């Protein structure tokens, strides 16, 4: 329904091994379309989706420029972080930043994203109002003084509400066939032995898109949460996703359990039982 464009930056320092690595990946919803790796022989923005390859040289060159600037900036960010937390120059550290825009149904910015972490923990994040910052600790508040002083939030809001949404719309149009699609999952229930008096009912949903999906179990109409196991939604590698949810059920009680699937590709939510 509503769409989004998100960029993911990862900067990894490595003392005694030269410059830090900087990867940037672009996503429209659950589909990657651009990459940039400083550890490539010839660093440059590359296409990872077919609907972006037809972009003019200007696009790729400028994107490469921005990527390089970001890389340098984050290389500085790592040292700065070393100074803020008073850390040694020997350890390896990581900075991650996710930022993007949720294009709402009204065609306006439903939600804006700009959040970063240090060594896997919240650092600083742009708030919902897109005017204020939330700093995780006293070290991030330095950066906060900095970004408030330069009115960074205003600029970034300008980006999110404008260029971000616009490029998102363009991407949605050029890749309409693969981006604006809702593929329902192929579902099925399997039985597995566990105990002399117990078994496992595994509910399968395969080849669906987008990733968002709801897989549940019910016992005679009443939701069932105990003895359940729902694996993290996984990629098929072909632009689809997979997911299964299992339940441990006493032998002879199989018929009393049902699996419920919700996905935007389904006209109506599914109800499944184990079939001979």
């Amino acid at each position: 329904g509503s769409h989004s464009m998100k960029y993911f930056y990862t900067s990894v320092s490595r003392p005694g091994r030269g410059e830090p690595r900087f990867i940037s990946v672009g996503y429209v919803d659950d589909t990657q379309f651009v990459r940039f790796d400083s550890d490539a022989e010839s660093p440059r923005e590359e296409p990872r989706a077919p609907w972006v390859e037809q972009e003019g040289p200007e696009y790729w060159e400028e994107a490469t420029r921005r990527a390089k600037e970001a890389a340098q900036t984050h290389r500085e960010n790592l040292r700065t972080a070393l100074r803020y937390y008073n850390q040694s120059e020997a350890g390896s550290h990581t900075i991650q930043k996710m930022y993007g825009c949720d294009l709402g149904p009204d065609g306006r910015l439903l939600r804006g994203y700009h959040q970063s972490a240090y060594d896997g923990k919240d650092y600083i994040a742009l708030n919902g109002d897109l005017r204020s910052w939330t700093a995780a600790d006293m070290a991030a508040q330095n950066t906060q003084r900095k970004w408030e002083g330069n009115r960074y939030a205003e600029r970034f809001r300008a980006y999110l509400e404008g260029e971000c949404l616009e490029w998102l719309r363009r991407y949605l149009e050029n890749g309409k066939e693969t981006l604006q699609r809702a593929d329902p999952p192929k579902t099925h229930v399997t039985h597995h032995p566990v105990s002399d008096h117990e078994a496992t009912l595994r509910c399968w949903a395969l080849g669906f898109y987008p990733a968002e999906i709801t897989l549940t179990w019910q016992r005679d109409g009443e939701e069932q949460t105990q003895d359940t196991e729902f694996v993290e939604t996984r990629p098929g590698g072909d632009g689809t996703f997979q997911k299964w949810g299992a339940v441990v059920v006493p032998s002879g009680e199989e018929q009393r359990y049902t699996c419920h699937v919700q996905h935007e590709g389904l006209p109506e939510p599914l109800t499944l039982r184990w079939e001979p």
Binding site: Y7, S24, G26, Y59, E62, A63, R66, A67, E69, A70, T73, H74, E76, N77, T80, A81, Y84, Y99, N142, T143, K146, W147, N150, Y152, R155, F156, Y159, E163, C164, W167
Partner: peptide
């Protein structure tokens, strides 16, 4: 496309 703005820490 990525953002033009990326202020230092």
């Amino acid at each position: 496309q990525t953002s033009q703005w990326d202020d230092p820490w």
